[PDB]
Design a protein around this ligand. Structure first.
Ligand code: BR
Ligand code: BR
Ligand code: BR
Ligand code: BR
Ligand code: BR
Ligand code: BR
Ligand code: BR
Ligand code: BR
Ligand code: BR
Ligand code: BR
Ligand code: BR
Length: 581
């Protein structure tokens, strides 16, 4: 392949190629107007066609990286709008892209994209191409590590929704449920993918493969070890390319993998057939989301091979990584009911046990009981989910979020209020989604979702580190991350944040906010109450918040809203203090 970009263009097709370039640019250059991005995509795409037709043309042999980078450095507003991102252009590859990646913004704080059915159907009417391009543009800029080929797929869902619902008399009736569900799907996928990219960055490729050996062994328990390994090797390569911004290569390799999975579905899983009848993007998504296959009925006990066999230290000496990979695959396929981290924790203990045991002068004797060690590990997660789902089913979502906001704020009161509020809200929604699920599916859902929320917190906290405890938990070890967070507790040495009346002062402009923005303001007040009076109980904190909430509702219902806030406000701010002693 003389020319990489011809090759990409040839393999991907003009539409998706175009689509991926729009996405890539929107992730790198998050503020630029949609129109500026359209032009860039068109330029790159032109040059691609020149090359596909003639690979000797000036510059067609340069790497995609180099071509994209040079293109980014061309932007007329780069310095003006993106500032020090412009300094990256002085660097050379591969450092240039590294430098660009660091400057992707994980908290871009763009206006909340909400469904406006009368509005959007008519935008869908006025110009559709701009409409489906904009969607990709808006999602990409808000989620700078979003999984390239998956975004193009959600766009199609987006198109299919509008095309169906905009003709009916009752567009909103049809439309809103659909868009609401799609926002949720986007959030979850973006969090899933950010965790992969975070793992590459902080723990490396090894950690990403183990995580993936576990997950895929659970999904495809029927598959033998060499399949799993092959698929995992290819999928890691794919996600590494996407996390680094190489969306064309990412996508091209992803189509190859989807092809491979579909040509070997008999040897992988029986739940693949419907997926493998689909067009490309649908097919890849369908595979990404496939239900776990049924446990096979011919699997032996793991003891024989992993506790009883007397040459185990021998094997473990010769092929450490391989042999432990074999343990992880075997253990994970038997346990479709465990979170990926729990599995990884288990594997780490096994590895640790062998190194301990294999120095002792009779290793069979001790590692004989290695499986006893996994009991307490399995049990802890089971307790946390039961503790949380119990609280959730009792008090409802909003109260659950509140209880989590308080709990996390006590653990890490230095962390910003916007971040504390976000994790707590996110974790409340996990309660709604996960708790109603069968126990075989509840542990994994809440713990796999919890992993994603902790990662988000660590991503935000790494932008501007403020708590050492948090850094330690975020950077020590992916498998121990949840236990590390669970162990955090209010430090005896924490100095309360000094009181600031303004921080608890509300005004009428809250009345015109969306409900969820209303709750965010209230929930932010909650976190600050905790920062100022950290020793206050959750029950005292719930009462004070109830009083602010009753105050806001009333004043927002008043004829003279502003007079109500002005008179009533200071009374609350005063009494709040004493209520939290
Ligand atoms: Br170009
Ligand atoms: Br993202
Ligand atoms: Br690329
Ligand atoms: Br794909
Ligand atoms: Br096969
Ligand atoms: Br802290
Ligand atoms: Br999250
Ligand atoms: Br933070
Ligand atoms: Br916890
Ligand atoms: Br006011
Ligand atoms: Br109060």
């Amino acid at each position: 392949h003389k020319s990489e970009i011809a090759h990409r263009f040839n393999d991907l097709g003009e539409k998706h190629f175009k689509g991926l370039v729009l996405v890539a640019f929107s992730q790198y250059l998050q503020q630029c107007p949609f129109e500026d991005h359209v032009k860039l995509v068109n330029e790159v795409t032109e040059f691609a066609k020149k090359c596909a037709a003639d690979e000797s043309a000036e510059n067609c042999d340069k790497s995609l990286h180099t071509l994209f980078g040079d293109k980014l450095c061309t932007v007329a507003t780069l310095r003006a709008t993106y500032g020090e991102l412009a300094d990256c252009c002085e660097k050379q590859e591969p450092e240039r892209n590294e430098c660009f990646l660091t400057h992707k913004d994980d908290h871009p704080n763009l206006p909340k994209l909400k469904p406006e059915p009368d509005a959007q159907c008519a935008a869908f009417q006025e110009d559709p191409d701009k409409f489906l391009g904009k969607y990709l543009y808006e999602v990409a800029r808000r989620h700078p590590y979003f999984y390239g080929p998956e975004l193009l797929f959600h766009a199609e869902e987006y198109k299919a929704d509008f095309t169906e619902c905009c003709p009916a008399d009752d567009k909103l009736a049809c439309l809103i449920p659909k868009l609401d569900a799609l926002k949720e799907r986007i959030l979850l996928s973006s969090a899933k993918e950010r965790l992969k990219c975070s793992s590459f960055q902080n723990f490396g490729e090894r950690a990403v493969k183990a995580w993936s050996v576990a997950r895929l062994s659970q999904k495809f328990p029927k598959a033998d070890f060499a399949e799993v390994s092959k698929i995992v090797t290819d999928l890691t390569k794919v996600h590494k390319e996407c996390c680094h911004g190489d969306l064309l290569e990412c996508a091209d390799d992803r189509a190859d993998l989807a092809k491979y999975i579909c040509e070997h579905q008999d040897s992988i899983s029986g739940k693949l057939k419907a997926c493998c009848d689909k067009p490309l993007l649908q097919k890849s998504h369908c595979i990404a989301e496939v239900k776990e296959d049924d446990l096979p009925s011919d699997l032996p006990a793991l003891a024989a091979d992993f506790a009883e066999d007397k040459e185990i230290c021998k094997h473990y000496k010769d092929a450490k990584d391989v042999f432990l990979g074999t343990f992880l695959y075997e253990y994970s396929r038997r346990h479709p009911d465990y979170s990926v981290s729990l599995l990884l924790r288990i594997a780490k203990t096994y590895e640790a046990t062998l190194e301990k045991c294999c120095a002792e002068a009779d290793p069979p004797a001790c590692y004989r009981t290695v499986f006893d060690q996994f009991t307490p590990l399995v049990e802890e997660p089971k307790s946390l989910v039961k503790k949380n789902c119990d609280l959730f089913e009792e008090v409802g979502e909003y109260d659950f979020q509140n209880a989590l906001i308080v709990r996390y704020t006590k653990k890490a009161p230095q962390v910003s209020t916007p971040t504390l509020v976000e994790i707590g809200r996110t974790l409340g929604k996990v309660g709604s989604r996960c708790c109603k699920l069968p126990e075989s599916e509840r542990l994994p859902c809440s713990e796999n979702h919890l992993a994603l929320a902790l990662n988000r917190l660590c991503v935000l906290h790494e932008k501007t580190p403020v708590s050492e405890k948090i850094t330690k938990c975020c950077t020590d070890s992916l498998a121990e991350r949840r236990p590390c967070f669970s162990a955090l507790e209010l430090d005896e040495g924490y100095v309360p944040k000094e009181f600031k009346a303004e921080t608890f002062t509300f005004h009428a402009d809250i009345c015109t906010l969306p409900e969820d923005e209303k709750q965010i303001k209230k929930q932010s007040a909650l976190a600050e109450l905790v920062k100022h009076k950290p020793k206050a109980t959750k029950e005292q904190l719930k009462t004070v918040l109830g009083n602010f909430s009753a105050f806001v509702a009333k004043c927002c219902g008043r004829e003279d809203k502003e007079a109500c806030f002005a008179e009533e406000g200071p009374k609350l701010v005063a009494s709040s203090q004493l209520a939290l002693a």
